[PDB]
Design a protein around this ligand. Structure first.
Ligand code: ZN
Ligand code: ZN
Ligand code: ZN
Lengths: 310, 437, 89
């Protein structure tokens, strides 16, 4: 196929990249000269600006880092593909997240928010809110998380309705944020409401972690009511999602699946091929494995001994 | 001009009868007169073909269709033949466009040309027919008829989406991109033998992802959302897991990056971004070959395999060469080359010792079949004036005893210069592709 | 050297292997016949008793899952409808 991008621009950008390991003051001027000589839109200059932010964040240079990020925000909506742009931006957001200047983190976030609003790119503005939302749940903040959830929900009404038919993808993130919200609060009334609202309209392509979290709440709700088949199914998918992603809660979710599997009065073994293999011999799961072995063998004396021992 | 004249005749007749006669005076006269005038004139004028119904629709006369709809609606059995003639014209237009005879038609242009026809007819329906249900039913039924005619069509359809997704320059705004693909699947619904279409659709979505990244992301999830809304589970869910495994790849690397932050890696592992996918969604390319690995990647793969077998026990990895890329730093300046995990073995042997031939790379490499030849020719055969692997017996065909050299090619002064001629004839046509079909 | 590799972006595929275990319906093993083949039939001549692989990547004896499909059809390890994607190992 081939397509002549530019001969001079790529040379000068990588020349500055070769000078990155040298003194930045000469390199950053060289990167700026690339941007001035960039002229036409800067797929390479976008990389140069991305590298400049990475370099400046090393030597604690925020003032122009966000000002050039605003240039990147305008650079998002000109030529660069959405896939590369938000992957670059997500890496920028993750790279800023490395330090602990949380004030600068959210100043970066709020500048990101309104910029993506302008170019009708609420797709990434939703993702940044989800990125900011997940961070909020980790440190238990709800004052602005609720505002985010309302704004994300506000972007999701089709005026008369409260949901779209393609933003069911978005409602996955919205409810997953709310699932973790009421996990700490232990609000069973909202937990079922979230799950019921989720189930019907969430039908879409989810992120594996989101699906596992949604199903994990459903298994808890079903177990707290009495349904064993539904709780077992929800724990099954949540553990399946955890395996693909790699969340540490997979072992804890497996314990949920084992208990639900034993509660439905079925001799079926909930390890099989789904629960890999080594998880049977895991020290935190070996006690559960012994419970399954005693449950299948109907050894009440051995079962009760394991209950008291562990 | 007759339709305007008869409309005026009705208007003056109804005006006279309500003002010069008694109060009601309208039911018997109007119905019989309207029925006779409309029935005979419509039949005799469409045979004449002198700017009748088919001609006044071909040139795009919005007013003529609008006045015809508002007049023929009063007489029963008028819309029935109106849609029948409209469907017949659509059939004639469809056959002249879905014609299969003649090779050399662009699949992207074929759908796009037909796509404009659907939008043009929809615009006429909205502007003139006032969104009549009968007209919508007939065009929907007609579109179901002429779209599933040819056999070689699901293959062409999947290529149309591939062109749209590969590059978005044509209509940079996502609204134009999404509209083209929105009503494109309207054509998809009117297609029987979905199994053969799915298999073609499975294969090319891999082809979209396995060459270059940075397609769209956000709309890629969006176009998947419409996919599950319209098709079903079994064949489509496999696709939705492929892009899901792409998310699995980076998330698995997020854990791998955490290990990179904790433990520093030596020269075997300077700069690695490995990827982890599941075989349950991503099909095998051709055979998952078993070629050799350069020593620096050998250590990197060994470290990753050891890490994956220690902290991620319960699954073992299989190495392959028909996937990925690399950045080969060459060295008057230092320009980094690019090899898509095909020439890495060939260049590594050259670094160990130059002046090799086809026999050298086929005896001490455990190299697969002609896919080597197609990969080998990516550096020598069919190359522009940016050659990174030259030979003295320059020929299109690849012989056995030919020596390879290297050229500077300062015309390729690009510190990261990429070789995009890797594909070339990878998916060639005729040799052994039709016989296995 | 003249050419040195700095970056590499290979893709490492993983597949659940050593899927030997137990046909959970028969509780004997993934192979070595089933309860309907070691306790039920005695002749076992011109017989088969293969494995049965589904869309959800689960594995059972062909005899065990087919008989389980009489009453229920929901793959008792989940709520999936258990399409039949393969037979044998
Ligand atoms: Zn069995
Ligand atoms: Zn059997
Ligand atoms: Zn299953």
């Amino acid at each position: 196929s081939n397509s002549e991008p530019n001969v001079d621009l790529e040379n000068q950008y990588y020349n500055s990249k070769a000078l990155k390991e040298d003194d930045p003051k000469a390199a950053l001027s060289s990167f700026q000269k690339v941007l001035e000589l960039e002229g036409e839109k800067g797929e390479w200059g976008f990389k140069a600006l991305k590298q400049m932010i990475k370099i400046n964040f090393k030597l604690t240079n925020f003032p122009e880092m966000m000002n050039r990020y605003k240039q990147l925000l305008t650079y998002i909506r000109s030529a660069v593909t959405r896939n590369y742009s938000e992957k670059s931006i997500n890496s920028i957001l993750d790279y800023i997240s490395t330090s602990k200047q949380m004030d600068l983190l959210q100043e970066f976030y709020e500048t990101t928010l309104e910029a993506l609003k302008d170019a009708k790119n609420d797709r990434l503005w939703f993702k940044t809110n989800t990125k900011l939302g997940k961070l909020y749940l980790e440190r238990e903040e709800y004052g602005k998380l609720q505002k985010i959830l309302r704004q994300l929900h506000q972007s999701c009404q089709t005026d008369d309705g409260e949901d779209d038919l393609k933003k069911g993808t978005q409602l996955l993130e919205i409810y997953a944020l709310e699932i973790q919200m009421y996990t700490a609060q232990k609000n069973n009334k909202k937990l079922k409401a979230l799950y019921e609202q989720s189930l019907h309209i969430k039908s879409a392509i989810p992120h594996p972690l989101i699906m596992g979290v949604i199903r994990e709440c459903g298994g808890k709700m079903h177990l707290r009511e009495g349904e064993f088949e539904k709780a077992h199914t929800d724990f099954f998918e949540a553990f399946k999602n955890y395996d693909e992603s790699g969340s540490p809660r997979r072992t804890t979710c497996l314990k949920y699946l084992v208990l639900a599997n034993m509660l439905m009065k079925s001799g079926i073994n909930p390890f099989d091929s789904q629960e890999a293999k080594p998880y049977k011999n895991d020290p935190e799961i070996l006690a559960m494995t012994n419970l399954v072995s005693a449950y299948q063998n109907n050894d009440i004396t051995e079962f009760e001994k394991i209950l008291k021992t562990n | 001009v007759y339709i305007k004249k008869v409309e005026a005749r009705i208007n003056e007749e109804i005006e006279r009868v309500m003002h010069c006669l008694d109060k009601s005076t309208e039911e018997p006269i109007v119905k019989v007169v309207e029925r006779e005038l409309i029935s005979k004139h419509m039949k005799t004028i469409v045979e004449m073909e002198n700017s009748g119904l088919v001609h006044m629709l071909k040139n795009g006369k919005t007013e003529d269709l609008g006045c015809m709809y508002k007049l023929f609606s009063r007489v029963p059995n008028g819309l029935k033949t109106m849609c029948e003639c409209m469907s017949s014209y659509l059939r004639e237009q469809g056959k002249a466009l879905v014609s299969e005879e003649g090779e050399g038609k662009n699949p992207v242009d074929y759908i796009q040309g037909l796509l404009d026809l659907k939008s043009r007819f929809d615009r006429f329906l909205l502007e003139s027919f006032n969104n009549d249900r009968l007209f919508k039913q007939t065009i929907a039924g007609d579109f179901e008829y002429f779209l599933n005619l040819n056999s070689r069509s699901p293959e062409y359809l999947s290529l149309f989406i591939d062109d749209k997704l590969k590059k978005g320059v044509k209509g940079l705004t996502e609204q134009e991109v999404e509209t083209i693909l929105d009503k494109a699947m309207v054509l998809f619904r009117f297609m029987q033998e979905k199994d053969v279409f799915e298999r073609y659709y499975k294969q090319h979505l891999a082809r979209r992802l396995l060459t270059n990244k940075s397609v769209s992301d956000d709309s890629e999830k969006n176009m998947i959302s419409k996919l599950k809304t319209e098709c079903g589970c079994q064949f489509t869910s496999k696709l939705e897991g492929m892009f899901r495994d792409m998310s699995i790849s980076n998330t698995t690397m997020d854990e791998f990056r955490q290990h990179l932050q904790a433990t520093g890696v030596s020269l075997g592992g300077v700069d690695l971004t490995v990827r982890v996918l599941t075989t349950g969604y991503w099909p095998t390319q051709s055979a998952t070959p078993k070629c050799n690995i350069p020593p620096a990647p050998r250590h990197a793969f060994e470290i990753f395999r050891r890490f994956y077998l220690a902290k991620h026990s319960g699954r073992q990895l299989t190495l392959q060469h028909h996937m990925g890329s690399a950045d080969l730093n060459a060295t008057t300046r230092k320009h980094i080359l690019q090899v898509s995990t095909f020439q890495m073995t060939i260049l590594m042997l050259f670094n160990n010792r130059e002046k090799y031939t086809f026999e050298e790379i086929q005896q001490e490499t455990d190299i697969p079949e002609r896919e080597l030849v197609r990969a080998l020719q990516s550096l020598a055969c069919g190359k522009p004036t940016q050659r990174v692997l030259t030979k003295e017996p320059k020929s299109k065909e690849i012989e056995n005893g030919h020596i390879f050299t290297v050229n500077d090619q300062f015309t390729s002064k690009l510190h990261r210069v990429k070789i995009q001629t890797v594909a070339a004839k990878q998916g060639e046509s005729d040799p052994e592709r039709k016989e296995t079909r | 050297k003249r050419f040195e590799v700095k970056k590499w972006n290979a893709v490492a595929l993983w597949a659940w292997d050593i899927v030997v275990d137990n046909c959970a319906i028969c509780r004997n093993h993934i192979m070595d016949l089933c309860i309907e083949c070691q306790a039920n039939q005695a002749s076992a001549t011109s017989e088969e008793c293969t494995v049965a692989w589904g869309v959800c990547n689960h594995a059972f004896h062909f005899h065990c899952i087919s008989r389980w499909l009489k009453t229920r059809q929901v793959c008792p390890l989940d709520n999936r409808e258990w399409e039949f994607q393969k037979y044998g190992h």
